[model samples]
Target chain A: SGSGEPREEAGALGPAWDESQLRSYSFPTRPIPRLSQSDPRAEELIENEEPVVLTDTNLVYPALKWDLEYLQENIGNGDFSVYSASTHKFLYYDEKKMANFQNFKPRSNREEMKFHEFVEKLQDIQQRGGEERLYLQQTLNDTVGRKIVMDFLGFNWNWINKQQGKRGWGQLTSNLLLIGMEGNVTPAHYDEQQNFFAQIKGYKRCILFPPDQFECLYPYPVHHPCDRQSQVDFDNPDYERFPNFQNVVGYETVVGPGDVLYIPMYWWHHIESLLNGGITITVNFWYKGAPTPKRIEYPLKAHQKVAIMRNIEKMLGEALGNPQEVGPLLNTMIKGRYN
Target chain B: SGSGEPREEAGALGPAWDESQLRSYSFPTRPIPRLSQSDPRAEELIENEEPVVLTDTNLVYPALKWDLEYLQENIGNGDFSVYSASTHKFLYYDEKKMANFQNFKPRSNREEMKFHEFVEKLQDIQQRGGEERLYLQQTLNDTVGRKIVMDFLGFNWNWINKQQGKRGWGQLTSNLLLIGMEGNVTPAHYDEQQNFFAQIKGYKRCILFPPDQFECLYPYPVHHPCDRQSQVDFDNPDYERFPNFQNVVGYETVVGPGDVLYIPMYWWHHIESLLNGGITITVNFWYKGAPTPKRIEYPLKAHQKVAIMRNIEKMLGEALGNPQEVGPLLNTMIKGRYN
Candidate 1:
């Protein structure tokens, strides 16, 4: 804790995030035609428990594009900071003086918020997740294009469940607006719920895989760190350590502006932005699950077994450390009842 | 390739599966009902998509328990050999017993043929990823009067998806399993998928947080071998390095056999096996997502942007090594995008 590592994570005046990138990050942009309310697709989506991405025809909030710059100038020079490296040595903010097109972290008010170029503040939604980064939950007010963002998130609760039913069967879980510039990456990993990924601005590429491929995909084991993804390098893919990695196949998509993509539950995904591209923005919807056929009628599957394994994990983890005895205690629990 | 490891992953039985534990590792025999395919609860499980454990039932195989004798005999004998700690040199059977697991090259026969023990196997799974772990598609066959493991998974499938439709809308992508014995710890971390953790045999404990609580969880950053999990010691959770971790509010569950719990998608879960426990087994189920809501109809918040950010990881992993690139790239991308 006493290492004199130059105070990292200093706020920075982020490089211009909304800089027009027609030259490099350009992709064909097409407005998805709105599904007629009565269209079979829309009706089916709602009826079947699926969510469809209906495009917003108008670019009402051109300011959403300049959001990065607005935040930089207003939020005290984009000096946002987060945990750095895998070591967990506290956070190190972007102290580097991001030039015209450089990175920025908003330094403390003690340092005179330098509005170098572009930066912003995020509104936090405390109840669920992403508590660290400035929450983007800012009232999506009239000034900040709140209506536009909200509309993108589907405030029409009535049709939401129905549409979701059409696509798949599950409970609607969580939601959040996601915005990032240039080269952000959400590492590849699987989730337990269903997801529908939609792109609002800029561009991003997504790759996915099914869950049973746990052996093929690999996950971080236990309580160290980086728990859900495999350490095997994906670019070159270490054939030596992971001889079977070569067999992995994936589905991919590039969502630009209004394109929406549905991600099945329990599927693993990896996403990235084009090099030197503009800020990538989007929203995601999550859900629980529907029912299944009978055991003999349908036969059980791997995910179910793993879910049971999780209970076992809880029982086991609780047994170790100060957590209390879980596994052995459980063994004491299931004895002979089957007898 | 020339190593005399077992030529092929011999059917279930390993010559080196240690012959010690067979005698001593016996669990109490129970007359708990076999998961009845027709039991109302079993049928409910199918209808609910939630896997249930027949709390008072017997789920072990006498035959496998017999193998515990060999396990007991070879306990820690190193005759069965394993990769050296902190490195990859192998220390298993061979006149050349000096090979370090770190420096050792993988011999399909020696490493594969010989038994890949629980902890080591977990470590290996961590080193690779779900992509590399693509299951062989085959599932456990049902025993007399027992329900097929797949049946359990399918049951959970129906339940989970139906609920998913109501909540975050994230669907079941896949269910994953990481089976191990006592002394095995699945490091703390987050996941990209939704999960239903059903503890089958033995006990396991789980610690979880919403992804938004990244600061509290303190995951290892890019480039680290242990990705997706936190590096902090939960015993002495470093307040200095991870001050915000103090703000983290998490829930824990001790699921006994027959207890099925659902872990919402994108939520972070850290799993641990109890110390000195017997063999623990598990199965999991994963499903595809329901589509994203059309028309942003409901007020349900969404994190499509975060989902989109995930693309950064995929693109970078594809373009650069899974290592060197993820960090710097994420920094660059989020710098001005979301402060």
Candidate 2:
């Protein structure tokens, strides 16, 4: 299945995997709709800023054969950023927040390690059943070896470029190569840019929530290290601090080789390499949002409102000159005045 | 224009009055798109919950001749509720909030008077150029005399009922009969229920804003008497109190006889009878929103998010006990956390 070929023995079960492979969480979630690349409804979903899994598309066909051995030979000898966490979760944080917020401390630690050394640590951890988990996340750039760059350049740019052009999306920013050990999790968080997440190896379970669920997700303050990340722990939610988590509804899907998931900007998502599913390899295309239309129509979109909320927060933060004062001022403005 | 017949002398201008009839405000506004009732885009706009001026629709044909004199003769001897304001603005207020908040005082006063008396008061104010302005807003019900009820019953029900059924809107709660003197203004505010405002006798200028502009509008507290109404005075906005008001963009249109303006739920609108345009009469159909879908889709609509925001505010208000404490608690939660 990881080699882009369905196992004949699996039969009607499709991807040779079962429910047992996925990690359980408290919130209710329905499956994300799967559509063929040729399906008209797929484009409709994308245009509406809804998530959909595009199947049977050669979006990253050149990278499908990429595995540990192949990458060990093709990837550069230069140091790659490897993030290690004490537990399975590798929660992302903003580096700038560390200095700005004196009390802020991140759970994961990052270090520069050669690609082979990171691979060795991952194998050793799997063999020893250690608590520490390693994830190698780096941008695909000039630092990569020649063959790796050749594969990157051979990706289905025509289809993706057409999608970008048709949708009036801004320029493509960077493509990040993500490698994670089995069962390693990237906790729920939202990004400001659009993403085309392509799976190249192994299976990964993804859970997503719309931006409107901001209230239920309980995101940290904009100034916090985990600004876009949820404050609640999905496995051990603190109901006393975030009771709204009980009402959060999510959409879930498991992507294997040759699958591409279009993650609309500002949509929150959590990803995990399927348990016992071996290593997962993925590449994500990030793009800036389209320029705002000069004439804004009525009934603004959800993401647009999120942008407005962010502006309100930043404006309050600057006007008050203290992050702590932002909340109080907003409270005073809205407390009894709004329903 | 008041009689529903276009003056031949006006020619291409469509109506007898022009921009000179509209009162000037500081904020920038674009004209609301006007479409014929049969226009396909009209329904599209309605479906998207955007305000549009629907022209040449006889939605309230029977009420076209409903002037103050006609109403006085046929509106029965039943008492009508007339709201009187010291100025031209007849700002609405919730009666329940008056007793709930000890310090709450409404700018307008309501009184129960006979339909003829209300009409007389309106005429008296018009003739004397008095500060007091009267607006007779009462529900159209069985209490209205036989002739008036006959006309009300003769309204374009088949068309309106089809619109209600096609949209899956909830029950038709009430039809409000609003009669106001020239230049009388209903200050900017939003209602929870959807509205189909049908103009009858004269022209009324409506300025509308989408619900997402919540940050710019500065609505009064839910518990206040003027709940859902903007705190800033549009005619003379205080920049220091509402700096965002300067950036507010609005959609405006003048609705005349045979015109029905779809006032989508949760849309903020400021309405005024055109200056020197004579008495304006309108009948509005209010309906409850459609039932919340069991399986809510991703990328919730703007109005849906507004509903979620309202729930959050109410939940925080109840949890905190004191209205003042709600702000401080929310401030504590969001301060320094979100950007």
Candidate 3:
């Protein structure tokens, strides 16, 4: 009961969604589509790697109890990887960023700070009109209090594990604890691994574009660290440079505590803290996608095609030994060859 | 046993694929990705709308016994619609063409002819130089022999229907009987409806481009009768005009008698009679796609997005009330706004 502050409720914020403002932010353009567990076609939906919100399934009960003060107290003392920026943007795994977060160079303005300091800074910014952005990203560690661990284990792993087993995706690799103030933004990007992002404490809007929109999204070159990040800025997307972006119809949904959103591998997702929302805390389960199953699914899925394209890029880059040459070679080969 | 002419064998032609010359013609670029029917994840593959080669499934065994003479003698006499073209290009359902062959007005160097005459012309051309192209595009009619219908009735409708049921697509609508002489080509285009294409006699190379490549394919405006056909020409692609066409990567496959290909809705496909091959016979079962399921699939599927884009085009065209205004209005709305 010594948690320094009272837990906050979800959906306490979010405007009538100022039309242009909301559209600019690519707000939950539409309700995140969901499927019932009892549906006979649920498994089929999962295998297709379509984004599905499993409603009313008590997969993470402990997450419901998570709040900023509660986490600061029980989450234990550690040098947290908190990225702070002058602006709302904190593009995860951007050009210079990596999973390790060590020596993460400040790109487009972001800085690492201590967990307690991160919390203090967020509170300070809130009191001072909320000009700064801070994101507390700490990998879950065993050092967190035992009561916290009890709740950690309280997640419906039996259910989650069953899903993991059924998914053919490999073992649950790790979980990351994330805390963010309202307006914290993770720019549009994709990851090689599959994720089960569990929302806790507050509502967050998530927008996803499938791998099929690869051209529209304009992912950076495979050789670049920014490989998975889209070059187009959703807010100020330059249509001339990214004409296909106009064609992007994002699949969006607002998530709250007790909700788990399946983030299929290579799916481009952009997460943002709901405007005027309180601090947001969440944990995500990352897992290795199953090795090419004995039976590879076909027309080869959009994500797989992206993966294949990335591979072809790598192979061609190596064979050509020059990225510039690869593009030109591909141009020479594909142009006039395929219409 | 007294069929009018000798039944021809399959794949009497097709070479090592003559490079650019072959590519120019849109010969089956390569087999579209497929999953075997026996694969453990076959159902999963279907949900993803991946093109698949349904092997070991004898749904069309009755149709397998079909050839020119068997079909000609048993198919009965009727005003079967056939299109004749001097060039290999024989784009169907193009520029005012329709599924119903009634009062058909052929466009851009194509002419309509009768079935027997169509056959006679093909043979006549073959004997002379095999330079011209003839495509018999007929709707299956009750006039066909009862034996042929017995086999038509014999099609594993139960199995086919089960697939239809599982796919969540709508009822079987109609089937078309198509026969093409060597070098006959169907320009690249997409269909609004789903199809189960079965190759019954001779070999045809089928090339498919996913709906995601819509830009590259440069489909015609819906207001135009050539709505689904790409503006880009495979044989003489104009890269300056259709720059995106340079990036097109087609999924290709060749199907022969007894082979069934599940052609998902909205996939751009280009089919051709193998060069020097005898007449090619095939039949396709058409079905309406399922109504939007409760859980809409996402990055929203390429096909679904195309449907959505079509709806937008309709709403916009109606709002603007002029088809000419739609493009400019979209340009004004999306240009600086989306970018």
Off by over 4 Å in 3: A1-30, A35-44, A94-112, A294-298, A322-325, A335-339, B1-339
- As for model 1, its CA RMSD to the true structure in angstroms is 25.0
* Two-chain DockQ for each candidate model: 0.01, 0.08, 0.01
Interface RMSD of each: 22.2, 12.1, 14.8
Clashes counted in candidate 2 amount to: 11
User: Can you write out model 2's per-residue Cα lDDT over B118-174, one digit (the tens) per residue?
Assistant: 877776866797878788889977888899878988888988898899889999999
Tell me how far the alpha carbon of residue B280 in candidate 3 is from the true structure, in angstroms, after superposition.
43
lDDT of 2 by residue, A13-113 (tens): 56566667777788888778889988999999999889999986788999999999999888988888899998888878889766647877778989998
CAPRI tier of model 1: incorrect
| TM-scores, each model vs. reference | 0.33, 0.53, 0.47
Query: Once superposed on the true structure, which residue ranges of model 1 sit more than 4 Å away at CA?
Result: A1-66, A70-161, A165-172, A222-224, A291-297, A320-339, B1-339
Per-residue CA lDDT of model 1 for B39-148, tens digit only, reads 67654653333333343222222212222334333323222322222311111223232221234343212322123253445457556742221111112223212322
User: Model 3, A1-339: lDDT tens per residue?
Assistant: 111122244587533232222225432244456656556566676778877776555777876887767766777766787776777877554543243234445554445555567778777876798676778877888877777888988888887888888888898888998888876788899998889888877767788887777767777656555667887887887878777777876787767777788888888988887777667777899999988866654445667556655655565555444444445433332232221
Q: Best by DockQ, which number?
A: 2
> What interface RMSD does candidate 1 have?
22.2
Model 1 lDDT at residue B313: 38
What is the lDDT, from 0 to 100, of the residue A206 in candidate 2? 87
Q: By summed lDDT, which 10 consecutive residues of candidate 2 chain B come out lowest?
A: B1-10
| Least accurate 10 contiguous residues by lDDT in model 3 chain A | A1-10
